[PDB]
């Protein structure tokens, strides 16, 4: 399954 995040990675 392709995942298409709409935001950058957040560590916080």
């Amino acid at each position, epitope marked *: 399954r392709p*995942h298409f*995040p*709409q*935001f*950058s*990675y*957040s*560590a*916080s």
Partner: single-chain antibody, 227 residues
Framework: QLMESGGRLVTPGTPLTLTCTAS??????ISWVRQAPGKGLEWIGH?????TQYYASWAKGRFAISRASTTVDLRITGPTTEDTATYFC?????????????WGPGTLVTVSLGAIDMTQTPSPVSAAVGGTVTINCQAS????????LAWYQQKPGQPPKLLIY???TLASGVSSRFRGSGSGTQFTLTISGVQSDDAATYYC?????????????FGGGTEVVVE
């Protein structure tokens, strides 16, 4: 803690900047959200950790989000009485999904000369101490990736508190008396073992396909009143 600052009384057309500080925000992405007196939360827009900008369509040309070093700012470009509201900043939690794990308590702006619908259970809903209440949240279009939906508890004058994210994941430190369920367009919050202190307004909040409309929306809020 996040803290919003800079709210005051201004005349229509007078640019006003609000600030968002922590006590390291430079690693945080931040959204601005407002709430007119007695009304629901409304997303304004979002700035990434490196300055990428996202806006609600209604906010274009009315609000400009910027950041540098220690601070994230919101300029209210040309205010009207439509803009009288408490303004909140909120940090996005861990991962890739748009939900917020920390809020400030808000700053009040007053302006004076002196297609997404998220429908929740109508206010108020009554619950007895020790009982169980369920709150509905229906979205006109599906939330992103089926499950990108959060719930918040809001009491007067206090930072909204994250309860649930990703439809069913309990936020750190929150009582397991709170359960989130659902998928797609249909969601529930269940409060078990109701307590006097659960009296609050509850909001669902979706992330949505940014090419289908705004990236975020909120339900209208359901106030729980405890017998």
């Amino acid at each position: 803690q996040l803290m919003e600052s800079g709210g005051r009384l201004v005349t229509p057309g007078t640019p006003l900047t609000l600030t968002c500080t922590a006590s390291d925000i430079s690693t945080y992405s931040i959204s601005w959200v407002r709430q007119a007196p007695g009304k629901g939360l409304e997303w304004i827009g979002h700035i990434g950790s490196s300055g990428t900008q996202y806006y609600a369509s209604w906010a274009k040309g009315r609000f400009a989000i910027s950041r540098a070093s220690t601070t994230v700012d919101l300029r209210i470009t040309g205010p009207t009485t439509e803009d009288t509201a408490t303004y909140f900043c909120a940090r996005r939690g861990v991962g890739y999904n748009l939900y917020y794990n920390m809020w400030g308590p808000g700053t009040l702006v007053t302006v004076s000369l002196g297609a997404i619908d998220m429908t929740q259970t109508p206010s108020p809903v009554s619950a007895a101490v020790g009982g169980t209440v369920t709150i509905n949240c229906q979205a006109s279009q599906s939330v992103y990736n089926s499950k990108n939906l959060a719930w918040y508890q809001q009491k007067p004058g206090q930072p909204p508190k994250l309860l649930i994210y990703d439809s069913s994941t309990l936020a750190s430190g929150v009582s397991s008396r709170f359960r989130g369920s659902g998928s797609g367009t249909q969601f529930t919050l269940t409060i078990s073992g109701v307590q006097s202190d659960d009296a609050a307004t509850y909001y669902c909040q979706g992330e949505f396909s940014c090419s289908s409309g705004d990236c975020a929306g909120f339900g209208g809020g359901t106030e729980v009143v405890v017998e």
